[PDB]
CSV table of N, CA, C and O and ligand atoms in Angstrom, one decimal:
chain,number,residue,atom,x,y,z
A,1,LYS,N,0.9,-1.3,0.0
A,1,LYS,CA,0.0,0.0,0.0
A,1,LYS,C,0.8,1.2,0.0
A,1,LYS,O,1.8,1.2,0.8
A,2,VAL,N,0.5,2.2,-0.8
A,2,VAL,CA,1.1,3.6,-0.8
A,2,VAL,C,0.2,4.4,0.0
A,2,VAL,O,-0.9,4.8,-0.5
A,3,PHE,N,0.6,4.8,1.2
A,3,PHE,CA,-0.3,5.7,2.0
A,3,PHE,C,-0.3,7.1,1.5
A,3,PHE,O,0.7,7.6,1.0
A,4,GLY,N,-1.4,7.8,1.8
A,4,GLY,CA,-1.4,9.2,1.8
A,4,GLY,C,-0.7,9.7,3.0
A,4,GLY,O,-0.6,9.0,4.0
A,5,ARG,N,-0.3,10.9,3.0
A,5,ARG,CA,0.5,11.5,4.1
A,5,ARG,C,-0.3,11.5,5.4
A,5,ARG,O,0.1,11.1,6.4
A,6,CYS,N,-1.5,12.1,5.3
A,6,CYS,CA,-2.3,12.1,6.5
A,6,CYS,C,-2.9,10.7,7.0
A,6,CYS,O,-3.1,10.5,8.1
A,7,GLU,N,-3.1,9.8,6.0
A,7,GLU,CA,-3.5,8.5,6.2
A,7,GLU,C,-2.4,7.8,7.0
A,7,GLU,O,-2.6,7.1,8.0
A,8,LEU,N,-1.1,8.0,6.6
A,8,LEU,CA,0.0,7.4,7.3
A,8,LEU,C,0.2,8.1,8.7
A,8,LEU,O,0.4,7.4,9.7
A,9,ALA,N,0.1,9.4,8.8
A,9,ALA,CA,0.0,10.0,10.1
A,9,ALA,C,-0.9,9.3,11.0
A,9,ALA,O,-0.6,9.1,12.2
A,10,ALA,N,-2.2,9.1,10.6
A,10,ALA,CA,-3.2,8.5,11.4
A,10,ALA,C,-2.8,7.2,11.9
A,10,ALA,O,-3.1,6.8,13.0
A,11,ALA,N,-2.3,6.3,10.9
A,11,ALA,CA,-1.8,5.0,11.2
A,11,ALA,C,-0.7,5.0,12.2
A,11,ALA,O,-0.7,4.2,13.2
A,12,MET,N,0.3,5.9,12.0
A,12,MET,CA,1.4,5.9,12.9
A,12,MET,C,1.0,6.4,14.3
A,12,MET,O,1.5,5.9,15.3
A,13,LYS,N,0.1,7.4,14.4
A,13,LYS,CA,-0.5,7.8,15.7
A,13,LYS,C,-1.2,6.7,16.3
A,13,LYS,O,-1.1,6.5,17.5
A,14,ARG,N,-2.1,6.0,15.6
A,14,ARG,CA,-2.9,5.0,16.3
A,14,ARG,C,-2.0,3.9,16.9
A,14,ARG,O,-2.3,3.3,17.9
A,15,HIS,N,-0.9,3.6,16.2
A,15,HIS,CA,0.1,2.6,16.6
A,15,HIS,C,1.2,3.1,17.5
A,15,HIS,O,2.1,2.4,18.0
A,16,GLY,N,1.0,4.3,18.0
A,16,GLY,CA,1.8,4.8,19.1
A,16,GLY,C,3.1,5.5,18.9
A,16,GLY,O,3.9,5.6,19.8
A,17,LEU,N,3.3,6.0,17.7
A,17,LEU,CA,4.6,6.7,17.3
A,17,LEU,C,4.6,8.2,17.6
A,17,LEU,O,5.7,8.9,17.6
A,18,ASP,N,3.5,8.8,17.8
A,18,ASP,CA,3.5,10.3,18.1
A,18,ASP,C,4.1,10.6,19.4
A,18,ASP,O,3.6,10.2,20.5
A,19,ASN,N,5.3,11.2,19.4
A,19,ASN,CA,6.1,11.6,20.6
A,19,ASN,C,6.8,10.4,21.2
A,19,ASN,O,7.4,10.5,22.3
A,20,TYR,N,6.9,9.3,20.4
A,20,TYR,CA,7.6,8.0,20.9
A,20,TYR,C,9.1,8.3,20.9
A,20,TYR,O,9.7,8.9,20.0
A,21,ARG,N,9.7,8.1,22.1
A,21,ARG,CA,11.0,8.6,22.4
A,21,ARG,C,11.2,10.0,22.1
A,21,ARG,O,12.3,10.4,21.8
A,22,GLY,N,10.2,10.9,22.3
A,22,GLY,CA,10.3,12.3,22.1
A,22,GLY,C,10.3,12.7,20.7
A,22,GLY,O,10.5,13.9,20.4
A,23,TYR,N,10.0,11.8,19.7
A,23,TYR,CA,9.9,12.2,18.3
A,23,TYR,C,8.5,12.4,17.9
A,23,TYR,O,7.7,11.5,17.8
A,24,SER,N,8.1,13.7,17.7
A,24,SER,CA,6.8,14.0,17.3
A,24,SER,C,6.4,13.3,16.1
A,24,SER,O,7.3,12.9,15.2
A,25,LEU,N,5.1,13.1,15.9
A,25,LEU,CA,4.6,12.3,14.7
A,25,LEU,C,5.2,12.8,13.4
A,25,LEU,O,5.4,12.0,12.4
A,26,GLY,N,5.3,14.1,13.1
A,26,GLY,CA,5.9,14.6,11.9
A,26,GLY,C,7.2,14.0,11.5
A,26,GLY,O,7.6,13.9,10.3
A,27,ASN,N,8.0,13.8,12.5
A,27,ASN,CA,9.3,13.1,12.3
A,27,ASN,C,9.2,11.7,11.6
A,27,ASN,O,9.9,11.4,10.7
A,28,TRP,N,8.2,11.0,12.1
A,28,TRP,CA,8.0,9.6,11.6
A,28,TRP,C,7.4,9.7,10.2
A,28,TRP,O,7.7,8.9,9.3
A,29,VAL,N,6.5,10.6,10.0
A,29,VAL,CA,5.9,10.7,8.6
A,29,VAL,C,6.9,11.2,7.7
A,29,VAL,O,6.9,10.7,6.5
A,30,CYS,N,7.7,12.2,8.0
A,30,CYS,CA,8.8,12.7,7.2
A,30,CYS,C,9.7,11.6,6.8
A,30,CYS,O,10.1,11.4,5.7
A,31,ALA,N,10.1,10.8,7.8
A,31,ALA,CA,11.1,9.7,7.6
A,31,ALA,C,10.5,8.7,6.6
A,31,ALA,O,11.2,8.3,5.7
A,32,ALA,N,9.3,8.4,6.8
A,32,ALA,CA,8.6,7.5,5.9
A,32,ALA,C,8.6,8.0,4.5
A,32,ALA,O,8.7,7.2,3.5
A,33,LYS,N,8.2,9.3,4.3
A,33,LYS,CA,8.2,9.8,3.0
A,33,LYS,C,9.5,9.6,2.2
A,33,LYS,O,9.6,9.2,1.1
A,34,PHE,N,10.6,9.9,2.9
A,34,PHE,CA,11.9,9.9,2.2
A,34,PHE,C,12.6,8.5,2.3
A,34,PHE,O,13.5,8.3,1.5
A,35,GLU,N,12.1,7.7,3.2
A,35,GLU,CA,12.6,6.3,3.3
A,35,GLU,C,12.0,5.4,2.2
A,35,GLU,O,12.6,4.5,1.6
A,36,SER,N,10.7,5.5,2.0
A,36,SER,CA,9.8,4.6,1.2
A,36,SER,C,8.9,5.2,0.2
A,36,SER,O,8.1,4.5,-0.4
A,37,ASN,N,8.8,6.6,0.2
A,37,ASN,CA,7.8,7.3,-0.5
A,37,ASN,C,6.4,6.8,0.0
A,37,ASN,O,5.4,6.7,-0.8
A,38,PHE,N,6.3,6.5,1.3
A,38,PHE,CA,5.1,6.1,1.9
A,38,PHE,C,4.5,4.7,1.4
A,38,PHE,O,3.4,4.4,1.5
A,39,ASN,N,5.4,3.9,0.9
A,39,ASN,CA,5.1,2.7,0.2
A,39,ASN,C,5.5,1.5,1.1
A,39,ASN,O,6.6,1.3,1.3
A,40,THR,N,4.5,0.8,1.7
A,40,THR,CA,4.8,-0.3,2.5
A,40,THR,C,5.6,-1.4,1.9
A,40,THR,O,6.3,-2.1,2.5
A,41,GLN,N,5.5,-1.5,0.6
A,41,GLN,CA,6.2,-2.6,-0.2
A,41,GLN,C,7.6,-2.3,-0.6
A,41,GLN,O,8.3,-3.2,-1.2
A,42,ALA,N,8.1,-1.1,-0.3
A,42,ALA,CA,9.5,-0.7,-0.6
A,42,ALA,C,10.5,-1.6,0.0
A,42,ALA,O,10.5,-2.0,1.1
A,43,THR,N,11.5,-2.0,-0.9
A,43,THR,CA,12.7,-2.7,-0.6
A,43,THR,C,13.9,-2.1,-1.2
A,43,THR,O,13.8,-1.6,-2.3
A,44,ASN,N,15.0,-2.1,-0.6
A,44,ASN,CA,16.2,-1.5,-1.1
A,44,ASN,C,17.4,-2.2,-0.5
A,44,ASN,O,17.6,-2.1,0.7
A,45,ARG,N,18.1,-3.0,-1.4
A,45,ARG,CA,19.4,-3.7,-1.1
A,45,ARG,C,20.5,-2.7,-0.7
A,45,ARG,O,20.7,-1.6,-1.3
A,46,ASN,N,21.2,-3.1,0.4
A,46,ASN,CA,22.4,-2.4,0.8
A,46,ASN,C,23.6,-3.1,0.4
A,46,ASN,O,23.7,-4.3,0.2
A,47,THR,N,24.7,-2.3,0.5
A,47,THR,CA,26.1,-2.9,0.0
A,47,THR,C,26.5,-4.1,0.8
A,47,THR,O,27.1,-5.0,0.2
A,48,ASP,N,26.2,-4.2,2.0
A,48,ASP,CA,26.7,-5.2,3.0
A,48,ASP,C,25.9,-6.5,2.8
A,48,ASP,O,26.1,-7.4,3.5
A,49,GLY,N,24.9,-6.5,1.9
A,49,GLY,CA,24.0,-7.7,1.7
A,49,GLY,C,22.8,-7.7,2.4
A,49,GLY,O,21.9,-8.6,2.2
A,50,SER,N,22.6,-6.7,3.3
A,50,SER,CA,21.3,-6.6,3.9
A,50,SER,C,20.3,-5.8,3.0
A,50,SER,O,20.7,-5.3,2.0
A,51,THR,N,19.1,-5.8,3.4
A,51,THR,CA,18.0,-5.1,2.7
A,51,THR,C,17.2,-4.3,3.7
A,51,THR,O,17.0,-4.7,4.8
A,52,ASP,N,16.7,-3.2,3.2
A,52,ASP,CA,15.7,-2.4,4.0
A,52,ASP,C,14.3,-2.6,3.5
A,52,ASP,O,14.1,-2.7,2.3
A,53,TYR,N,13.3,-2.7,4.4
A,53,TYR,CA,12.0,-3.1,4.1
A,53,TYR,C,10.9,-2.2,4.7
A,53,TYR,O,11.0,-1.8,5.9
A,54,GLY,N,10.0,-1.9,3.9
A,54,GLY,CA,8.8,-1.3,4.3
A,54,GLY,C,8.8,0.2,4.4
A,54,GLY,O,9.6,0.8,3.9
A,55,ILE,N,7.7,0.7,5.0
A,55,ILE,CA,7.4,2.1,5.0
A,55,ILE,C,8.5,2.8,5.8
A,55,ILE,O,8.8,4.0,5.5
A,56,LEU,N,9.1,2.2,6.7
A,56,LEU,CA,10.2,2.8,7.4
A,56,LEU,C,11.6,2.2,7.1
A,56,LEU,O,12.6,2.5,7.6
A,57,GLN,N,11.7,1.4,6.0
A,57,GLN,CA,13.0,0.9,5.5
A,57,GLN,C,13.9,0.3,6.7
A,57,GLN,O,15.0,0.6,6.8
A,58,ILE,N,13.3,-0.6,7.4
A,58,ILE,CA,13.9,-1.3,8.4
A,58,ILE,C,14.8,-2.4,7.9
A,58,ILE,O,14.5,-3.2,7.0
A,59,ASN,N,16.0,-2.5,8.5
A,59,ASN,CA,17.1,-3.2,7.9
A,59,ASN,C,17.2,-4.6,8.4
A,59,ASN,O,17.1,-4.9,9.6
A,60,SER,N,17.6,-5.5,7.5
A,60,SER,CA,17.6,-7.0,7.9
A,60,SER,C,19.0,-7.3,8.6
A,60,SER,O,19.1,-8.5,9.0
A,61,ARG,N,19.9,-6.5,8.6
A,61,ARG,CA,21.2,-6.7,9.4
A,61,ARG,C,20.9,-6.9,10.8
A,61,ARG,O,21.5,-7.7,11.5
A,62,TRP,N,20.0,-6.1,11.4
A,62,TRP,CA,19.8,-6.1,12.8
A,62,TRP,C,18.4,-6.4,13.2
A,62,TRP,O,18.2,-7.0,14.3
A,63,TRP,N,17.4,-6.1,12.4
A,63,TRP,CA,16.1,-5.9,12.9
A,63,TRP,C,15.1,-7.0,12.5
A,63,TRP,O,14.1,-7.2,13.2
A,64,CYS,N,15.3,-7.6,11.3
A,64,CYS,CA,14.2,-8.5,10.8
A,64,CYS,C,15.0,-9.6,10.1
A,64,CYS,O,16.1,-9.4,9.7
A,65,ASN,N,14.4,-10.8,9.9
A,65,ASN,CA,15.0,-11.9,9.2
A,65,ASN,C,14.5,-12.0,7.8
A,65,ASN,O,13.3,-12.1,7.6
A,66,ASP,N,15.4,-11.9,6.8
A,66,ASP,CA,15.0,-12.1,5.4
A,66,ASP,C,15.6,-13.3,4.8
A,66,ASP,O,15.4,-13.5,3.6
A,67,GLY,N,16.3,-14.1,5.6
A,67,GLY,CA,16.8,-15.4,5.1
A,67,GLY,C,18.0,-15.2,4.2
A,67,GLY,O,18.6,-16.3,3.8
A,68,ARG,N,18.5,-14.0,3.9
A,68,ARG,CA,19.7,-13.9,3.1
A,68,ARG,C,20.7,-12.8,3.5
A,68,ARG,O,21.5,-12.3,2.7
A,69,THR,N,20.7,-12.5,4.8
A,69,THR,CA,21.7,-11.6,5.4
A,69,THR,C,22.5,-12.4,6.4
A,69,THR,O,22.2,-12.4,7.5
A,70,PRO,N,23.6,-13.1,6.0
A,70,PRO,CA,24.3,-13.9,7.0
A,70,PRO,C,24.8,-13.1,8.2
A,70,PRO,O,25.2,-11.9,8.1
A,71,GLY,N,24.7,-13.8,9.3
A,71,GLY,CA,25.1,-13.4,10.6
A,71,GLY,C,24.5,-12.1,11.0
A,71,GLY,O,25.1,-11.3,11.8
A,72,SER,N,23.3,-11.9,10.5
A,72,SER,CA,22.5,-10.8,11.0
A,72,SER,C,21.7,-11.2,12.2
A,72,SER,O,21.6,-12.3,12.7
A,73,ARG,N,21.0,-10.2,12.8
A,73,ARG,CA,20.2,-10.4,13.9
A,73,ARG,C,18.8,-10.0,13.4
A,73,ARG,O,18.5,-9.4,12.2
A,74,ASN,N,17.9,-10.4,14.2
A,74,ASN,CA,16.5,-10.2,14.1
A,74,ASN,C,15.9,-9.8,15.4
A,74,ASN,O,15.1,-10.5,16.1
A,75,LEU,N,16.3,-8.5,15.7
A,75,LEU,CA,15.9,-8.0,17.1
A,75,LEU,C,14.4,-7.7,17.2
A,75,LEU,O,13.9,-7.7,18.3
A,76,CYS,N,13.7,-7.5,16.1
A,76,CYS,CA,12.3,-7.3,16.1
A,76,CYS,C,11.5,-8.6,16.1
A,76,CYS,O,10.3,-8.6,16.2
A,77,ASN,N,12.2,-9.7,16.0
A,77,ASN,CA,11.6,-11.1,15.9
A,77,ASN,C,10.5,-11.2,14.9
A,77,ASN,O,9.4,-11.6,15.2
A,78,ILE,N,10.8,-10.7,13.7
A,78,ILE,CA,9.9,-10.8,12.6
A,78,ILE,C,10.5,-11.1,11.3
A,78,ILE,O,11.7,-10.8,11.1
A,79,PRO,N,9.8,-11.8,10.4
A,79,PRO,CA,10.3,-11.8,9.0
A,79,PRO,C,10.2,-10.4,8.4
A,79,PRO,O,9.4,-9.6,8.7
A,80,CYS,N,11.2,-10.1,7.6
A,80,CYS,CA,11.2,-8.8,7.0
A,80,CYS,C,10.0,-8.6,6.1
A,80,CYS,O,9.6,-7.5,5.9
A,81,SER,N,9.4,-9.7,5.5
A,81,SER,CA,8.2,-9.5,4.7
A,81,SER,C,7.0,-8.9,5.5
A,81,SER,O,6.2,-8.3,5.0
A,82,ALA,N,7.0,-9.1,6.8
A,82,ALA,CA,6.1,-8.6,7.8
A,82,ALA,C,6.0,-7.1,7.7
A,82,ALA,O,5.0,-6.4,8.0
A,83,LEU,N,7.2,-6.5,7.4
A,83,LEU,CA,7.3,-5.1,7.3
A,83,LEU,C,6.9,-4.5,6.0
A,83,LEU,O,6.9,-3.3,5.8
A,84,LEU,N,6.4,-5.4,5.1
A,84,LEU,CA,5.9,-4.9,3.8
A,84,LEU,C,4.4,-4.9,3.7
A,84,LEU,O,3.8,-4.6,2.7
A,85,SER,N,3.7,-5.3,4.8
A,85,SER,CA,2.3,-5.4,4.9
A,85,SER,C,1.7,-4.0,4.7
A,85,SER,O,2.2,-3.0,5.1
A,86,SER,N,0.5,-4.0,4.1
A,86,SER,CA,-0.4,-2.8,4.1
A,86,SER,C,-0.6,-2.3,5.5
A,86,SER,O,-0.7,-1.1,5.7
A,87,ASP,N,-0.7,-3.2,6.4
A,87,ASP,CA,-0.9,-2.9,7.9
A,87,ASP,C,0.5,-2.7,8.4
A,87,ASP,O,1.3,-3.5,8.4
A,88,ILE,N,0.7,-1.5,8.9
A,88,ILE,CA,2.0,-1.1,9.4
A,88,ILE,C,2.3,-1.4,10.9
A,88,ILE,O,3.4,-1.0,11.4
A,89,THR,N,1.4,-2.1,11.5
A,89,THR,CA,1.7,-2.5,12.9
A,89,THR,C,3.1,-3.1,13.1
A,89,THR,O,3.9,-2.6,14.0
A,90,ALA,N,3.6,-4.1,12.3
A,90,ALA,CA,4.9,-4.7,12.5
A,90,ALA,C,6.0,-3.6,12.3
A,90,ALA,O,6.9,-3.6,13.1
A,91,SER,N,5.8,-2.8,11.3
A,91,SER,CA,6.8,-1.8,11.0
A,91,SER,C,6.9,-0.8,12.2
A,91,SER,O,8.1,-0.4,12.6
A,92,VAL,N,5.8,-0.4,12.7
A,92,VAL,CA,5.8,0.6,13.8
A,92,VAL,C,6.4,0.0,15.1
A,92,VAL,O,7.2,0.6,15.8
A,93,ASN,N,6.1,-1.3,15.4
A,93,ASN,CA,6.6,-1.9,16.6
A,93,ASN,C,8.1,-2.1,16.5
A,93,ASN,O,8.8,-1.9,17.5
A,94,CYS,N,8.6,-2.4,15.3
A,94,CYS,CA,10.0,-2.5,15.1
A,94,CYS,C,10.6,-1.2,15.1
A,94,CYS,O,11.7,-1.1,15.8
A,95,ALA,N,10.0,-0.2,14.5
A,95,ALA,CA,10.5,1.2,14.6
A,95,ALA,C,10.7,1.7,16.1
A,95,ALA,O,11.7,2.3,16.4
A,96,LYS,N,9.8,1.3,16.9
A,96,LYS,CA,9.9,1.6,18.3
A,96,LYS,C,11.1,1.0,18.9
A,96,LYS,O,11.8,1.7,19.7
A,97,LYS,N,11.4,-0.2,18.5
A,97,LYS,CA,12.6,-0.8,19.1
A,97,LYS,C,13.9,-0.1,18.6
A,97,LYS,O,14.9,0.1,19.3
A,98,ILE,N,13.9,0.1,17.3
A,98,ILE,CA,15.1,0.8,16.7
A,98,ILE,C,15.4,2.1,17.4
A,98,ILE,O,16.5,2.5,17.7
A,99,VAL,N,14.3,3.0,17.5
A,99,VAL,CA,14.6,4.3,18.0
A,99,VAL,C,15.0,4.3,19.5
A,99,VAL,O,15.5,5.3,19.9
A,100,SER,N,14.6,3.1,20.1
A,100,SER,CA,15.0,3.0,21.5
A,100,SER,C,16.4,2.6,21.8
A,100,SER,O,16.8,2.6,22.9
A,101,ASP,N,17.2,2.2,20.7
A,101,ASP,CA,18.4,1.4,20.8
A,101,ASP,C,19.6,2.2,21.2
A,101,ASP,O,20.7,1.7,21.5
A,102,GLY,N,19.5,3.6,21.2
A,102,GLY,CA,20.6,4.4,21.6
A,102,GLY,C,20.8,5.6,20.7
A,102,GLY,O,21.1,6.7,21.1
A,103,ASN,N,20.5,5.4,19.4
A,103,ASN,CA,20.8,6.4,18.4
A,103,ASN,C,19.6,7.1,17.9
A,103,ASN,O,19.7,8.0,17.0
A,104,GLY,N,18.4,6.9,18.5
A,104,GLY,CA,17.3,7.6,18.2
A,104,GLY,C,16.9,7.4,16.7
A,104,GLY,O,17.1,6.3,16.2
A,105,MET,N,16.4,8.4,16.1
A,105,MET,CA,15.9,8.4,14.7
A,105,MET,C,17.1,8.5,13.8
A,105,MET,O,16.9,8.4,12.5
A,106,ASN,N,18.3,8.8,14.3
A,106,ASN,CA,19.5,8.7,13.4
A,106,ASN,C,19.7,7.4,12.8
A,106,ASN,O,20.4,7.3,11.8
A,107,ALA,N,19.0,6.4,13.3
A,107,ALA,CA,19.1,5.0,12.6
A,107,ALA,C,18.6,5.1,11.2
A,107,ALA,O,19.0,4.3,10.4
A,108,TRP,N,17.8,6.1,10.9
A,108,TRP,CA,17.1,6.2,9.5
A,108,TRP,C,17.9,7.4,8.9
A,108,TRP,O,17.8,8.6,9.2
A,109,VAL,N,18.8,7.0,7.9
A,109,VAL,CA,19.5,8.0,7.1
A,109,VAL,C,18.6,9.0,6.4
A,109,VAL,O,19.0,10.2,6.5
A,110,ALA,N,17.4,8.7,6.0
A,110,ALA,CA,16.6,9.7,5.3
A,110,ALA,C,16.1,10.7,6.4
A,110,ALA,O,16.0,11.8,6.2
A,111,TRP,N,15.8,10.2,7.6
A,111,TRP,CA,15.4,11.1,8.7
A,111,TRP,C,16.5,12.1,9.0
A,111,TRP,O,16.4,13.3,9.1
A,112,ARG,N,17.8,11.5,9.2
A,112,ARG,CA,18.9,12.4,9.6
A,112,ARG,C,19.1,13.5,8.5
A,112,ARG,O,19.3,14.6,8.8
A,113,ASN,N,19.0,13.1,7.3
A,113,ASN,CA,19.3,14.0,6.2
A,113,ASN,C,18.3,14.8,5.7
A,113,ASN,O,18.5,15.8,5.0
A,114,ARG,N,17.0,14.5,5.9
A,114,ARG,CA,15.9,15.2,5.3
A,114,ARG,C,14.9,15.7,6.3
A,114,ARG,O,13.9,16.4,5.9
A,115,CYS,N,14.9,15.3,7.5
A,115,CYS,CA,13.9,15.5,8.5
A,115,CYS,C,14.4,16.1,9.8
A,115,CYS,O,13.9,17.1,10.3
A,116,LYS,N,15.6,15.6,10.3
A,116,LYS,CA,16.2,16.2,11.5
A,116,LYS,C,16.4,17.7,11.3
A,116,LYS,O,17.0,18.1,10.3
A,117,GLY,N,16.0,18.4,12.3
A,117,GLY,CA,16.3,19.8,12.2
A,117,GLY,C,15.5,20.6,11.3
A,117,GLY,O,15.8,21.8,11.0
A,118,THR,N,14.4,20.0,10.7
A,118,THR,CA,13.6,20.7,9.7
A,118,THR,C,12.2,20.9,10.4
A,118,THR,O,12.0,20.4,11.5
A,119,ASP,N,11.3,21.6,9.7
A,119,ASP,CA,9.9,21.8,10.3
A,119,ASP,C,9.1,20.6,10.1
A,119,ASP,O,8.3,20.5,9.2
A,120,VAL,N,9.3,19.6,10.9
A,120,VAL,CA,8.6,18.3,10.6
A,120,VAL,C,7.1,18.3,10.9
A,120,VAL,O,6.3,17.5,10.5
A,121,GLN,N,6.6,19.3,11.7
A,121,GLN,CA,5.2,19.5,12.0
A,121,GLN,C,4.4,19.6,10.7
A,121,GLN,O,3.2,19.2,10.5
A,122,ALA,N,5.1,20.1,9.6
A,122,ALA,CA,4.5,20.3,8.3
A,122,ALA,C,3.9,19.0,7.7
A,122,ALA,O,3.0,19.0,7.0
A,123,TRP,N,4.6,17.9,8.1
A,123,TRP,CA,4.1,16.6,7.6
A,123,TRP,C,2.9,16.2,8.2
A,123,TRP,O,2.2,15.2,7.7
A,124,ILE,N,2.4,16.8,9.2
A,124,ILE,CA,1.1,16.4,9.8
A,124,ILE,C,0.1,17.5,9.7
A,124,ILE,O,-1.0,17.4,10.2
A,125,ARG,N,0.5,18.5,8.9
A,125,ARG,CA,-0.4,19.7,8.7
A,125,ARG,C,-1.7,19.3,8.0
A,125,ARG,O,-1.7,18.4,7.1
A,126,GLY,N,-2.9,19.8,8.4
A,126,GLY,CA,-4.1,19.4,7.7
A,126,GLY,C,-4.7,18.1,8.2
A,126,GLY,O,-5.9,17.8,7.9
A,127,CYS,N,-3.9,17.3,8.9
A,127,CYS,CA,-4.4,16.0,9.2
A,127,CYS,C,-5.4,16.0,10.4
A,127,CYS,O,-5.2,16.7,11.3
A,128,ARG,N,-6.4,15.1,10.4
A,128,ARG,CA,-7.3,15.1,11.5
A,128,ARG,C,-6.8,14.1,12.5
A,128,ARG,O,-6.9,12.9,12.2
A,129,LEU,N,-6.1,14.7,13.4
A,129,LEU,CA,-5.4,13.8,14.4
A,129,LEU,C,-6.0,14.1,15.8
A,129,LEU,O,-6.4,15.3,16.1
B,1,CL,CL1,11.5,-15.1,10.3
B,2,CL,CL1,-1.9,0.4,9.6
B,3,CL,CL1,16.7,10.5,20.9
B,4,CL,CL1,5.1,17.0,14.4
B,5,NA,NA1,18.5,-10.3,10.0
């Protein structure tokens, strides 16, 4: 599924990301836009042989099992395909774990480069939240 911006905002809010580890919802919507273009089905292979999956481009080196990233971890205890579902529950739960890990939302390159330090409230403008 390709979410609309506010549609994704609402989904992320219902699933508990708004202000999760102090990151207001706009940060998460912004990260998703630039991580996946709001596309739950997005995948992108990394140089190290891991892949990123889903709306929040969660990586198979540490977070999910995709069966083809040797000596990786699966800290979210999920198959990476779970992160591609139209339903973003698994992605959000895994996102919570990642952001909790020490590095905050710096774990998402798109968030560091395109959302950190920007007016992220803009991403939830207009939304009925
Ligand atoms: Cl698995
Ligand atoms: Cl959802
Ligand atoms: Cl933080
Ligand atoms: Cl915000
Ligand atoms: Na893995």
